[PDB]
Amino acid sequence: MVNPTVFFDIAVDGEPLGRVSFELFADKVPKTAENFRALSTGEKGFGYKGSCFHRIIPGFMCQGGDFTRHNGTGGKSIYGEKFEDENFILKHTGPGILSMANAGPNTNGSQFFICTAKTEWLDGKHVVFGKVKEGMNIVEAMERFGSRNGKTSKKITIADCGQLE
């Protein structure tokens, strides 16, 4: 078994910026990693392609994953609307950590965030399931369009995504 690598191609108001690839820890959180992997290939008939990063706060994180309502309120898992917090073995140790956004205990859907700093206050509350493998400079470039309140000054979209390995 080798952990899956998935990629996103980011565009800023339609102009391609670059590729970010992620390693997903299916060896520690198989169910959360599988959810992100199938949503990145679109193989269940819905997924991240074409969705946006709706909330970016420089120094904190970039958040996206709402492919249903697009405004930050929706999204869903490949298991039904929401699923359980698989475990909290991994922490939010520094830039590059991939973790699930939620609305309290056991409410995981499709929304996720990429940490641009250690965010230890989220440990034990949000399930960490991946890391940026390549393209951290694209994530850094994305923060430039965010603000303290999270609204972005340009539309940041996942122009394409899929599985590499």
């Binding site: 958040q63 709402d66 999204g75 956004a101 939620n102 859907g109 949000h126």
Partner: peptide, 11 residues
């Protein structure tokens, strides 16, 4: 504040 939630985004 600095949280990541779906539904009611808190400070």
């Amino acid at each position: 504040x600095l949280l990541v939630t779906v539904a009611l985004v808190l400070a």
